[PDB]
């Protein structure tokens, strides 16, 4: 019971290609520009 299904590239490749890069770059850009207290 190891095999991921046939629709798994069509979801996982745009996920880590677009969505997680967008969330990552947004979170990192907000972290870079944060003022120290």
């Amino acid at each position: 019971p190891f095999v991921p299904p046939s629709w798994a590239p069509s979801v996982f490749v745009p996920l880590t290609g677009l969505v997680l890069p967008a969330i990552a770059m947004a979170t990192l850009f907000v972290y870079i520009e944060k003022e120290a207290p």
């Binding site: 190891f2 095999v3 991921p4 590239p9 069509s10 490749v13 745009p14 972290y31 870079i32 520009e33 944060k34 003022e35 120290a36």
Partner: protein
Amino acid sequence: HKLFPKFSQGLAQDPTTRRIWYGLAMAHDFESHDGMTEENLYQKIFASHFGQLSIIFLWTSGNLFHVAWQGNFEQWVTDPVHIRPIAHAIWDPHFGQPAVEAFTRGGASGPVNISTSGVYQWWYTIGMRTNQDLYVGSVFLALVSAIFLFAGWLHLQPNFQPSLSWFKDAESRLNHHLSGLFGVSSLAWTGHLVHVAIPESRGQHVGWDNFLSVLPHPQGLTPFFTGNWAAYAQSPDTASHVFGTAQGSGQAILTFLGGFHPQTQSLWLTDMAHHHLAIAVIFIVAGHMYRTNFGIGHRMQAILEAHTPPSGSLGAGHKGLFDTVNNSLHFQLGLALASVGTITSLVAQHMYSLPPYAFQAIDFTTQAALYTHHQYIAGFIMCGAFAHGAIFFIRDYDPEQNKGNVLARMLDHKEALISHLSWVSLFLGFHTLGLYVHNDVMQAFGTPEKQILIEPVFAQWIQAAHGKALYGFDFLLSSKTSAAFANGQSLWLPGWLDAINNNQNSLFLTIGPGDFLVHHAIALGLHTTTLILVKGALDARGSKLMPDKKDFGYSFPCDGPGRGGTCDISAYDAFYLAVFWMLNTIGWVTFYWHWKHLTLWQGNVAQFDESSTYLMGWLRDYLWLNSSQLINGYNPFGMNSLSVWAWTFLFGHLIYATGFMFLISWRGYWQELIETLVWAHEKTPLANLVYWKDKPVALSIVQARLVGLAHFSVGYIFTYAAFLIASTSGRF
């Protein structure tokens, strides 16, 4: 001011875009963070090494998982000569239907990539037969990666932080590593080979189900405890054995036969078993050398204090070097990188000529890819060894704790060192370039009989000393009446001789004047790169142009235009200048390797022997000739499977060229241009309502050198990898 980076408040108070890049580039240089102590340094290094371990095991589990789910591994093992290994499937929504048709090669459902990394031969040799074994291995290695990640989190917690005395305990670490991590791991790998990998090649499944009920040898442990160890070498595999079946099989588990298996053209599994068993015993004996808390053992500082010769030829000898290796981390990293780079060169040199895995060396693209991969890895690691040695001299070297020993006496005669490296570099360059230009002029003027062809009689003398009967020297292994020939004849020589007198393998290839000229070009590249790296390590404390260079550090831009101008004067800049020569030298060794093996694999070694003695033969018969099917990967008539390597070939030429911009053009042009851009943004209406938070400036000088060298090296690697994979896979 801003938070990032949290390790440097000097960088956190930077109002520019320099802060982001210098927070990225200084994140892992823990010695120069705010409030860094020594215990904190060693603890963060230990946790970081756990993080690297977890990333390595996650990488291997991902290779296993994508081969098990998307590869053709259960179909590859039946006919491994005619079936191409699949790496991973392609889901690219930018494709068109000709690309989906052309990358659906066979036997696959959709578009797939054909692997060159050679993992199918290694996994099939060590006993993998099904995809489910690869799934179990991937799940196991993902679990091991999670364990190392949790241990990296765990040994930073305050009830689990090791003391400084735990890290500087050298005798316990060498004893435990040389005993356990080397010998017990090699013994356990001998156990894996004997219990699983040798019976899998005999056609017998041995898994976790039945390994406690299948004897590796028909008389288990009675020859081992009787001392009748030659019983485990009786009846080896026949020279008509089909690998993976029982036809022509044997009973032995620990032989020493020599040479290759006849079908797979690879090393015998029983030879590799007795290899790992012998070195396992040797490492477990070697790991009982140093003095831990048991009274017996060697004391390393006493060994270093002892080895000082009379007449003072080494001065104080090795006195005071124990407190410079144990106290410094850059010295240890320099030793480690020197060793690992030389061992990586060793891995490449011994895996092309003595291929270990079954049906390796008939997959030619795998051979070329593995050799080129580990040679460039070794080149980068050797440059890093010399770089961290210069960092040792700048940061950690105390001259009063080294008054008179060998390390100070290296700084005492550094001018003779750099001068004689300069002499051998100039000699090899003048005469190698002069012989090549001479032979090019002889080939141009139509008279090849005039060209200087020096025969490599010394390496041919070595090949005759190893048993090659082509050059007629007939001594020590090539003469039948020799003592070494007669003593080794019963046991390991009949395989070694049969494998060394074959001209169809890479075991001690036939050499000539092209091989002469290229080995002297290789010596030129090595001695020149060593000149730049050694000169950067030794002039790091200071030169006559800059006597206080140790006061600025390792990586500073320059010292200004005064005193004639001092550009690229730091030791970092010597590293920067030596990476170009490293890329040059590995490019020479891989052009040479690849072209001699292409002429071997096609059949016409006379083409290499005739065309390698002059550089136009190189440019015409290796670069122009072997890049016809590459650049025809896509064209206005269509495309095929090599279009990705053509696009990557152009991609590498482009990144190379873009790195030339950072290497040639320098900062102040770009800073004036950015000042005009700042004016243009602040004056444009309806866009100046949006305003930057970090002030835009140009890249710094050191940053420019790093970015230019980075684009340079990435384009270099992608260009040659695209050409090598495309030529070797398209023409075979």
